[PDB]
């Protein structure tokens, strides 16, 4: 959200659907590497994971969100963490005893412009052509015989 007003919201399944659709072969494997255990790691292993976001301004510098021009609106991200995390907190539906609480940190890449264009960004109005996601969940009827 921008100043308390939402633009977009992504869900763990949207991320998986996106990864399933729009990434290429070599890239999808690096994505797997920073999101999962890919080397036959065993119980007790601990790893650092990175989940880059796919909001509109995360696909190209051309849509970079201008904090210099949104000086009246704080930019916020709300992170909802799942309780059912397979192989870390639960195994299927069964609780895993002794599971550690995740340690999380949010890193933001800032663009610093020089004085000439920075002045222009603050002064001039801007329009950005951005993308959002619309989503509701549904139940489907899958038959047997």
């Amino acid at each position: 959200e921008i100043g308390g007003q939402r633009i977009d919201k992504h869900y763990n399944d949207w991320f998986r659907t996106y990864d399933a659709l729009f990434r290429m072969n070599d890239d999808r494997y690096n994505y797997r590497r920073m999101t999962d255990w890919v080397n036959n790691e065993l119980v007790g292993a601990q790893k650092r994971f990175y989940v880059p976001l796919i909001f509109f301004f995360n696909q190209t510098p051309g849509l970079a969100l201008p904090l210099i021009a949104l000086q009246y609106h704080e930019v916020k991200l709300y992170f909802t963490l799942a309780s059912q995390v397979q192989g870390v907190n639960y195994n299927g539906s069964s609780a895993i005893a002794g599971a550690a609480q995740p340690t999380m940190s949010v890193w933001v890449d800032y663009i610093f412009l020089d004085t000439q264009e920075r002045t222009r960004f603050a002064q001039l109005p801007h329009e950005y052509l951005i993308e959002q996601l619309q989503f509701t969940g549904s139940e489907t009827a899958t038959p047997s015989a």
């Binding site: 100043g3 308390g4 007003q5 000086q71 009246y72 609106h73």
Partner: peptide, 11 residues
Amino acid sequence: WGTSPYLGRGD
């Protein structure tokens, strides 16, 4: 629009 943006730090 925010409908009441804070124009302190921002302005």
